[PDB]
Ligand binder design. Structure first.
Ligand SMILES: *[C@@H]1O[C@H](CO[C@@H]2O[C@@H](C)[C@@H](O)[C@@H](O)[C@@H]2O)[C@@H](O[C@@H]2O[C@H](CO)[C@@H](O[C@@H]3O[C@H](CO[C@H]4O[C@H](CO)[C@@H](O)[C@H](O)[C@@H]4O[C@@H]4O[C@H](CO)[C@@H](O[C@@H]5O[C@H](CO)[C@H](O)[C@H](O)[C@H]5O)[C@H](O)[C@H]4NC(C)=O)[C@@H](O)[C@H](O[C@H]4O[C@H](CO)[C@@H](O)[C@H](O)[C@@H]4O[C@@H]4O[C@H](CO)[C@@H](O)[C@H](O)[C@H]4NC(C)=O)[C@@H]3O)[C@H](O)[C@H]2NC(C)=O)[C@H](O)[C@H]1NC(C)=O
Ligand SMILES: *[C@@H]1O[C@H](CO[C@@H]2O[C@@H](C)[C@@H](O)[C@@H](O)[C@@H]2O)[C@@H](O[C@@H]2O[C@H](CO)[C@@H](O[C@@H]3O[C@H](CO[C@H]4O[C@H](CO)[C@@H](O)[C@H](O)[C@@H]4O[C@@H]4O[C@H](CO)[C@@H](O[C@@H]5O[C@H](CO)[C@H](O)[C@H](O)[C@H]5O)[C@H](O)[C@H]4NC(C)=O)[C@@H](O)[C@H](O[C@H]4O[C@H](CO)[C@@H](O)[C@H](O)[C@@H]4O[C@@H]4O[C@H](CO)[C@@H](O)[C@H](O)[C@H]4NC(C)=O)[C@@H]3O)[C@H](O)[C@H]2NC(C)=O)[C@H](O)[C@H]1NC(C)=O
Lengths: 207, 207
């Protein structure tokens, strides 16, 4: 029978009023014999009607995939409203229901600390600039790096890790040529999170 | 029908000859009617006989879970031999086969760097001692902390993260009372990985 997957908005999309956050309800394994698919959408159990549903699209394995997109209000998501997708198809004994929302719990402000390269790493051609982000809740977060107002791209960021006090932490690693670090250039780690003022902070690192 | 999932040994277990690494074949969706299941195990296709089946454990959805554990030899795993679990059950038209082995490729030695707490962090009652481990392959690794020869309890380690050159990195965070750090206690990050001499290195951190 068909399967339903419900996807949350991206962390950045709920934190910036200029962006447009969406919840996305995807149904796969829709058969040819019962290809009609109905979507109902509920917000805290109250039905809403503004979703945009796409025409079904046959896949190379001869099943259909159908997508419904519900735009959410930033403050609704951050207030913890629950979004329910109900998917009806004639091949199903009963409609499939999925629900998604922000992780429950009291938001906690991320603490952002930058850590310079270790002495021992300075023997190499490239060095590691570290951004520790700890004590935050929920785990939805975005982390970026820049220098002189331009985005540094050569970075990797670990997944959030559940810490022992129930908050989350992560590290981001930016790799730069040691000359750039030794020339005294200024590097900034940027963090977006609902519990930060203006949903954003940056912390600077340099020699 | 039932499903079979096959799990590798813990990284520490294969790296230390005193420990006993095992490959684990887990079978779920075993019915309440006739919950017997037979295991065959092969190492590079040669049948072995030292596996043990654990007691059945029924689940909250009225299914059983059945586990078979095969002890493996340290170099067999490290040399990339393939372990095959064959699961036979009356509900199967034909036996299920799953196969597992170590990630393929040239092992690479971890670089281990300890990073002291940020200046900004010293206002807190506890501080974060960081161990960056980068450039290793495969991703199987174990990290521990100690001080004065005894194991520290309050640490967390991120999962390995694929770096842009195809190696892995991670960070480990040890949280200590700021007093212990300011009194100049020496703290050590321990790393176990197959590409290290004696499968082990230690790097120390202090004020
Ligand atoms: C027939 O074909 C179809 C189509 O496949 C395509 O065509 C065929 C012919 C092939 O060529 C194939 O190569 C093609 O891809 C097959 O359809 C697939 O079916 C499987 C299930 O069988 C689906 O698997 C799930 O995938 C989820 C992840 O999906 C995303 O990521 C993958 C990449 O990994 C993408 O391929 C998908 O398209 C999804 O991409 C996401 O799409 C979102 C919606 O558009 C995006 O979000 C939106 O994005 C916009 C911007 O674009 C905005 O930001 C919006 O705000 C935002 O909403 C999102 O960005 C994008 N992500 C990425 C990374 O690109 C998995 O999450 C899921 O795993 C869960 O479920 C498993 C059980 O199935 C479970 O085991 C997992 O652990 C995980 O479990 C969940 O986790 C917790 C558990 O506590 C719970 O919360 C959940 O309840 C739990 N789940 C359950 C069920 O309990 C699945 O693995 C696959 O996605 C789907 N593909 C497509 C393209 O739809 C079909 O299977 C084929 N059939 C047969 C018989 O062969
Ligand atoms: C009825 O219920 C049962 C029971 O469910 C559970 O129990 C009840 C009481 C409820 O509480 C319920 O909510 C619970 O969920 C259901 O049984 C479940 O069945 C599903 C499948 O339907 C299983 O899902 C797979 O899980 C895999 C991971 O499982 C491990 O991790 C989870 C983490 O939550 C644990 O819960 C599991 O127990 C497993 O834990 C591991 O167990 C190992 C064995 O002991 C441990 O290793 C050993 O440990 C010792 C101690 O260290 C020694 O070290 C040994 O030496 C060592 O070997 C291991 O440490 C331990 N890990 C952890 C973290 O604890 C997933 O991998 C798997 O995903 C597969 O399928 C997905 C489907 O979408 C797919 O998306 C995935 O990608 C993945 O397979 C992928 O396949 C493709 C193709 O190759 C690849 O692209 C991918 O790379 C590949 N893998 C990955 C990772 O991408 C499933 O999610 C579930 O595990 C199982 N639960 C249990 C407890 O067994 C049953 O299904 C229900 N029936 C029905 C009809 O609903």
């Amino acid at each position: 029978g068909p399967s339903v997957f419900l996807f949350p908005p991206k962390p950045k999309d709920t934190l910036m009023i200029s962006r447009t956050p969406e919840v996305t309800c995807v149904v796969v394994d829709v058969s040819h014999e019962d290809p009609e698919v109905k979507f109902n959408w509920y917000v805290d159990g109250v039905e809403v009607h503004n979703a945009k549903t796409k025409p079904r699209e046959e896949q190379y394995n001869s099943t259909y995939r159908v997508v419904s997109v519900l735009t959410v209000l930033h403050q609704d998501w951050l207030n913890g409203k629950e979004y329910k997708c109900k998917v009806s198809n004639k091949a199903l004994p009963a409609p499939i229901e999925k629900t998604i929302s922000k992780a429950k719990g009291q938001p906690r402000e991320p603490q952002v600390y930058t850590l310079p390269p270790s002495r021992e790493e300075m023997t190499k051609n490239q060095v590691s600039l570290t951004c520790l982000v700890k004590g935050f809740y929920p785990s939805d977060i975005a982390v970026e790096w820049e220098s002189n107002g331009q985005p540094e791209n050569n970075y990797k960021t670990t997944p959030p890790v559940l810490d022992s006090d129930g908050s989350f932490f992560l590290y981001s690693k930016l790799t730069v040529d040691k000359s750039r670090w030794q020339q005294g250039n200024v590097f900034s780690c940027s963090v977006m999170h609902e519990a930060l003022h203006n949903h954003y902070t940056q912390k600077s690192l340099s020699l």
